[PDB]
Amino acid sequence: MESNNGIILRVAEANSTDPGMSRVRLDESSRRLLDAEIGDVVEIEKVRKTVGRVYRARPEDENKGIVRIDSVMRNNCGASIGDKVKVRKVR
């Protein structure tokens, strides 16, 4: 699947501090491609759309093409760990 106005990333599990906080961990490359500041509202899309705020991914995840969202958000958007999802800045 493709995206013209967002990016595609692989879903990974939340950082342990994240569940229930509507956080979307994105690396520097992803944030730059999306023109997303920390705190910007983004959407994760697969079967459905879920919304959350951008959080700085940790150094080990830089340039690994992943987005970290917790199990509730994965259920909301309809993705499993390792699935491709669309990440979109809410304009």
Are 22 and 13 in contact, with CB atoms under 8 Å apart?
no
CA angle (79, 80, 81) in 5-degree steps = 130
What is the count of structural domains for the chain? Answer: 1
Contact at 8 Å (CB) between 42 and 77?
A: no
Residue 83 falls inside a structural domain: yes
Q: How far apart are the first and last CA of the chain?
A: 22
CATH number for 47: 2.40.40.20
Please check whether residue 35 is in contact with residue 69, taking contact to mean a CB–CB distance below 8 angstroms.
no
Q: Is residue 3 part of a domain?
A: no
Q: Please check whether residue 1 lies inside any domain of the structure.
A: no
2 lies in a domain? no
- Catalogue the E-assigned strands of the chain: 7-12, 23-26, 41-45, 49-56, 66-68, 84-89
Full residue range of the structural domain in which residue 55 is found: 8-91
**What residues contact 65, with CB distance under 8 A and at least 6 apart?**
9, 10
